[PDB]
Design an enzyme around this catalytic site. Sequence first.
Site, PDB file in Angstrom:
ATOM      1  N   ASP A 129       0.780  -1.237   0.000  1.00 30.32           N
ATOM      2  CA  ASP A 129       0.000   0.000   0.000  1.00 30.32           C
ATOM      3  C   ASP A 129       0.813   1.290   0.000  1.00 30.32           C
ATOM      4  OD1 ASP A 129      -2.657   0.730  -0.443  1.00 30.32           O
ATOM      5  OD2 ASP A 129      -3.117   0.986   1.679  1.00 30.32           O
ATOM      6  N   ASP A 131       0.809   4.123  -1.303  1.00 29.79           N
ATOM      7  CA  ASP A 131       0.069   5.207  -1.942  1.00 29.79           C
ATOM      8  C   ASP A 131       0.813   6.513  -1.888  1.00 29.79           C
ATOM      9  OD1 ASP A 131      -2.296   3.850  -2.632  1.00 29.79           O
ATOM     10  OD2 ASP A 131      -2.981   4.021  -0.556  1.00 29.79           O
ATOM     11  N   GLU A 166       1.378   1.662  -6.342  1.00 27.07           N
ATOM     12  CA  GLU A 166       0.072   1.837  -5.750  1.00 27.07           C
ATOM     13  C   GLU A 166      -0.565   3.094  -6.342  1.00 27.07           C
ATOM     14  OE1 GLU A 166      -2.867   1.387  -3.647  1.00 27.07           O
ATOM     15  OE2 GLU A 166      -2.293  -0.391  -4.768  1.00 27.07           O
ATOM     16  N   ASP A 170      -5.918   7.709  -3.217  1.00 27.49           N
ATOM     17  CA  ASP A 170      -6.938   6.770  -2.751  1.00 27.49           C
ATOM     18  C   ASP A 170      -7.761   7.418  -1.649  1.00 27.49           C
ATOM     19  OD1 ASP A 170      -6.601   4.593  -4.410  1.00 27.49           O
ATOM     20  OD2 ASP A 170      -5.469   3.389  -2.982  1.00 27.49           O
ATOM     21  N   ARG A 218      -9.320   4.121 -12.904  1.00 28.78           N
ATOM     22  CA  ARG A 218      -9.762   4.678 -11.623  1.00 28.78           C
ATOM     23  C   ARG A 218      -9.671   6.211 -11.533  1.00 28.78           C
ATOM     24  NH1 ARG A 218      -7.524   0.217  -7.142  1.00 28.78           N
ATOM     25  NH2 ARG A 218      -8.204  -1.619  -8.341  1.00 28.78           N
TER      26      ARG A 218
HETATM   27 CA   LIG Z   1      -3.849   2.100  -1.764  1.00 27.49          CA
END
Ligand SMILES: [Ca+2]
EC number: 4.2.2.2
Length: 352
Positions: A129, A131, A166, A170, A218
């Site tokens: 993760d 990010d 990543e 988000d 996304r």
């Molecule tokens: Ca993420």
Amino acid sequence: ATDTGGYAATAGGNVTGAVSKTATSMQDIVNIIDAARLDANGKKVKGGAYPLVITYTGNEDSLINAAAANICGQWSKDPRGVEIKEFTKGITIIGANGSSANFGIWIKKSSDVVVQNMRIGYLPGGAKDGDMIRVDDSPNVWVDHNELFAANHECDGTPDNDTTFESAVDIKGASNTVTVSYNYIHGVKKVGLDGSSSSDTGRNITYHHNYYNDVNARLPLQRGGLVHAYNNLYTNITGSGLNVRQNGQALIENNWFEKAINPVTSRYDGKNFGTWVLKGNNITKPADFSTYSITWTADTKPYVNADSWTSTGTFPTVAYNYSPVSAQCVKDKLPGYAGVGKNLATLTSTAC
Ligand SMILES: [Ca+2]
């Protein structure tokens, strides 16, 4: 003062009593935030003791340039990021011009945080993760004028064949009001989710004046809630754009789409399709698809594409105030307002 041009209404750390600090490294940011939790007696204050305006002057170009040269060595490294957990006094992290970071900003259970003028790229730890920016259970967050990048590419043998890198932004949980504006996002496979799962529905998010170039999908992957996307420039979308799911509603206005596959769609669940209201974009009818190289593909499960380019639902009255320029002006001018080193300049019709 608190007008972001979207659902988020925050001045961040730019309030009364704000304490200005300079961070020359990631660790400084960490130490500065930690110090801001203590009162005059050295005791911790829940939510923070005072507001902060952190100017980040660090530069990690060497790390970024080394990663850009060995894209596939990034996913397996430890993730690097500054966590802003339960800090509600108001905080603003702004990078100095020439500033750069090879670490992300992870916001959790906080509110009133603004991150501006940060150039973040090629982060390590995509499999854990890593990010660039994460907004979790955090209302009133403004992510504005940042440059978020990596390589729009998937290396082989990565966990889930999805973790080379990543996401850029988000958003998940109770991050009820968020504004993502004037960002230059490029070379990103997974831009950002808006809800981490089928049950993580809701939120009111605004994406405005962002410049997307060479991104796979996304933009965002929306799960329920409301999304208002206006004045964004979408070019070179290699997978899909706005994916409206779980009965989400989207208002897609005055944006410029070009060289994009599935720019507006609802797929991957096979049900509970979201809806969109389209108006003022460069594409006004299916005839324009060829003109701007808009391609559509099907999915293996029931899906809905906007290949008829018609509104499929409604959208409640937009709460805040905003003044969108034309789609043409976005295409002509946006690149000079989005990103870092533009001195937080905004695009108005006066400049069109
Ligand atoms: Ca993420």
